[PDB]
Ligand binder design. Structure first.
Ligand SMILES: O=C(N[C@H]1COC(=O)[C@@H](NC(=O)c2cccc(O)c2O)COC(=O)[C@@H](NC(=O)c2cccc(O)c2O)COC1=O)c1cccc(O)c1O
Ligand SMILES: [Fe+3]
Length: 698
């Protein structure tokens, strides 16, 4: 099965029958437990949604490629409301070179450590064979409404042997998703008056991709393998008017249709793999270098996250991320039969950002200990980590898996993340699973940095109208979460029925603070002597929900599958507001008809439940009017198919959103001056869209 309790596999076959436009989030999000959301509740950058596991936010979803971390979004400014203007990190590997995807949710993910408090998504690539193989994949879609951006995608792969002990695989992808038209939300925008009249919330950003990966596998002995791989990728956007607050100016408009951010991502990795008598061994060194070049934005008030016209032009933020990992695996023959794993891990994150730390203090007054001009660009953190797993067979069919992970973060201090995972055959058809772990979150380098400084004259300040600063805070604690799950699954002859309950108790969630810690001195007029807030740890928050699956084989050629997410709770227990905005439930339904040996056909439905916006504004006050708007439940249906022409050639074709259900971003969630709020209506849902596809492979 592709769904056990806590875990989902997506195969290459699934990727082909629900072909993604471009980013994998599209298909990853259809698993149980998984949503596609922003990180907090502002609605800012709300068309830039990313994979969210059990409502824990997408910063707590750790993305791996072939077991190796992706850190690139940590190169984008982390803003006052916990969003980055980033597309996330699931669009680095092209869909057609993926062998499979693993999604691991809650207690089974905490053993991976930093940033897995929601879970892990591990994107696995196809590997070289016994003979030389390769493929050519093309995809092209066609929206009904021309406003919306079409997508085109071309990718190859090519792999095989060279000597008897030498293998290679390479692939390369070129793709484009056109942006939505700059005006796509016209007539649907929130009410905009005075200076802000005419402003627009934006449609989906476009992107251009170039990815090129090369790998050599060398197995210098029967027991010993050595891999070298390098990746070069580049995403450049197509800008369509998006700004943090939905305000506009002339620089914004000048840039409509142009590249305004480009991310270059380079990865190099050496991996040694060892298999002998006492068991298995594995170690790797990865260097990820991310360059994030974008137009300078402002860092104050309504000017936070809009192109700054006084400082026109590009800056480049640089992320050097360094990862090395070691492990061994020992079968142990003892009074209980078992498997032991011992490992270290070391990472370094260097961040150079010459832009984010440049807000100055001439208006709100200055801040003792913080220079107003030429603050450092630099941040870094190292975590060292040790861990051990034991995989214990109590009695055949029953497994107990304890592990301990310890992490030393060189600023925040020591973390202890223990875990315990149980599975139990109760019957030959029924299996009970339980897991309880404490997962780990390192503050990001923006939260942590006393030189990172934002400003507002009042509207964004919690509990007051005066000017205020927000400041990074090196005193911060790590976020930890006690992720519980209890689940039960019937499985027999492709009949599958399972239901899991999960609760994550969430401690020290980091977030812009509520009380001033101090006041600056000096500055101009009514803004002088502004209040100073920091990034704080929220003492307690909770998420809670249900994951279900049901799979029935209607007849031989024909399979009916369903995945269910239901979100019971999502609560900042300090403020009482919600953490993320999710749909109350999500049901995904596929019917799969294997009509002939050669022709497969697929119908799908997704039902999304209601969605509620935040209740409180940036002041902490209760919102009014269109800031309260909710999104009603809706469903999206789709048909597609794949017709095999030969061993060497298949064709695909279908329609996403059969019934043309469309939604439109009206703005951000709350009122500001001149720009009424849009509540939960913060994203654009695309309409009917035809697509075709073609895959040739030897
Ligand atoms: O969405 C927000 N703005 C909107 C809506 O607010 C406004 O348009 C006005 N605004 C206030 O009167 C205000 C009254 C009382 C208190 C204020 O802070 C006001 O701004 C004017 O400000 C501006 O025109 C611009 N703005 C600055 O230059 C600025 C420069 C330095 C410092 C600033 O604070 C600035 O606004 C752009 O502002 C906007 O478009 C918004 C969000 C989050 C936090 C904010 O502070 C926002 O203002
Ligand atoms: Fe302001």
């Amino acid at each position: 099965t592709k769904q056990a309790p806590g875990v989902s596999i997506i195969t290459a076959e699934d990727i082909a029958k629900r072909p993604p436009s471009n980013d994998l989030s599209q298909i990853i999000r259809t698993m149980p437990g998984v949503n596609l959301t922003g990180n907090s509740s502002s609605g800012q950058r709300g068309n830039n949604r990313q994979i969210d596991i059990r409502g824990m936010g997408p910063e707590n979803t750790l993305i791996l490629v072939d077991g190796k971390p992706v850190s690139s979004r940590n190169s984008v400014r982390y803003g006052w409301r916990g969003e980055r203007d980033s597309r996330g990190d699931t669009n680095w590997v092209p869909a057609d070179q993926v062998e499979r995807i693993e999604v691991i949710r809650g207690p089974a993910a905490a053993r991976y450590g930093n940033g897995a408090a929601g879970g892990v998504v591990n994107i696995i690539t196809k590997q070289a064979g016994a003979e030389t193989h390769g493929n050519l994949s093309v995809y092209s879609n066609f929206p009904q409404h021309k406003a919306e951006g079409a997508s085109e995608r071309m990718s190859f792969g090519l792999n095989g042997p060279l000597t008897e002990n030498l293998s290679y695989r390479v692939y390369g992808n070129i793709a484009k998703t056109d942006s939505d038209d700059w005006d796509i939300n016209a007539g649907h925008e929130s009410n905009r008056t005075g200076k802000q009249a005419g402003t627009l919330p934006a449609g989906r950003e476009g992107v251009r991709n170039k990815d090129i990966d090369g790998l050599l596998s060398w197995r210098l002995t029967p027991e010993q393998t050595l891999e070298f791989e390098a990746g070069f990728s580049r995403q450049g956007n197509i800008y369509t008017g998006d700004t943090q607050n939905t305000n506009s100016n002339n620089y914004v408009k000048q840039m409509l249709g142009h590249e305004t951010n480009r991310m270059y991502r380079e990865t190099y990795s050496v991996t040694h793999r060892g298999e002998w008598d006492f068991g298995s061994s594995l170690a790797y060194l990865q260097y990820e270098k991310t360059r994030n070049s974008r137009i300078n934005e402002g860092l104050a008030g309504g000017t936070e996250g809009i192109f700054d016209p006084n400082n026109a032009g590009f800056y480049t933020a640089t992320l050097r991320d360094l990862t090395a990992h070691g492990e061994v695996n020992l079968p142990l023959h003892l009074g209980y039969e078992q498997t032991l794993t011992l490992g270290s891990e070391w990472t370094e994150q260097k961040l150079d950002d010459p832009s984010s730390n440049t807000q100055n203090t001439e208006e709100g007054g200055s801040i003792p200990g913080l220079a107003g001009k030429n603050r450092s660009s630099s941040s870094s953190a190292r975590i060292f980590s040790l861990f051990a797993e034991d995989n214990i067979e109590l009695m055949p069919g029953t497994m107990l898996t304890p592990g301990l992970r310890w992490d030393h973060h060189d600023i925040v201090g020591d973390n202890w993340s223990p875990s315990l995972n149980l599975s139990h055959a109760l019957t030959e058809r029924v299996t009970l699973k339980a897991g309880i772990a404490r997962a780990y979150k390192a503050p990001n380098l923006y939260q942590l940095n006393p030189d990172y400084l934002l400003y507002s004259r009042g509207a964004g300040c919690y509990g007051q109208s005066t000017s205020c600063y927000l400041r990074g805070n090196d005193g911060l604690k790590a976020e930890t979460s006690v992720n519980k799950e209890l689940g039960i699954e019937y499985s027999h002859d492709g009949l599958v029925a399972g239901l899991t309950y999960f609760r994550n108790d969430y401690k020290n969630k980091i977030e812009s603070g509520l009380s001033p810690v101090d006041h600056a001195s000096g500055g101009k007029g009514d803004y002088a002597n502004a209040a100073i807030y920091q990034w704080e740890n929220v003492p307690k928050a909770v998420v809670e929900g249900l994951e279900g699956t049901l799979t029935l084989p209607l007849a031989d050629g024909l399979k009916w599958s369903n995945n269910l997410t239901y979100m019971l709770q999502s609560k900042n227990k300090e403020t009482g507001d919600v953490l993320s905005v999710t749909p109350r439930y999500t049901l995904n339904s596929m019917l799969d008809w294997q009509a002939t040996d050669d022709l497969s056909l697929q119908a799908t439905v997704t039902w999304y439940g209601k969605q509620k916006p935040k209740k409180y504004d940036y002041h902490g006050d209760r919102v009014t009017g269109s800031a309260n708007d909710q999104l009603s439940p809706y469903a999206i249906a789709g048909l597609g198919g794949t017709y095999r022409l030969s061993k060497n050639l298949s064709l695909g074709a279908g329609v996403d959103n059969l019934f043309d259900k469309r939604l439109f971003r009206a703005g951000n969630a709350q009122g500001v001056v001149g720009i009424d709020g849009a509540g939960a209506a913060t994203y654009n849902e695309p309409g009917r869209t035809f697509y075709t596809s073609l895959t040739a492979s030897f």
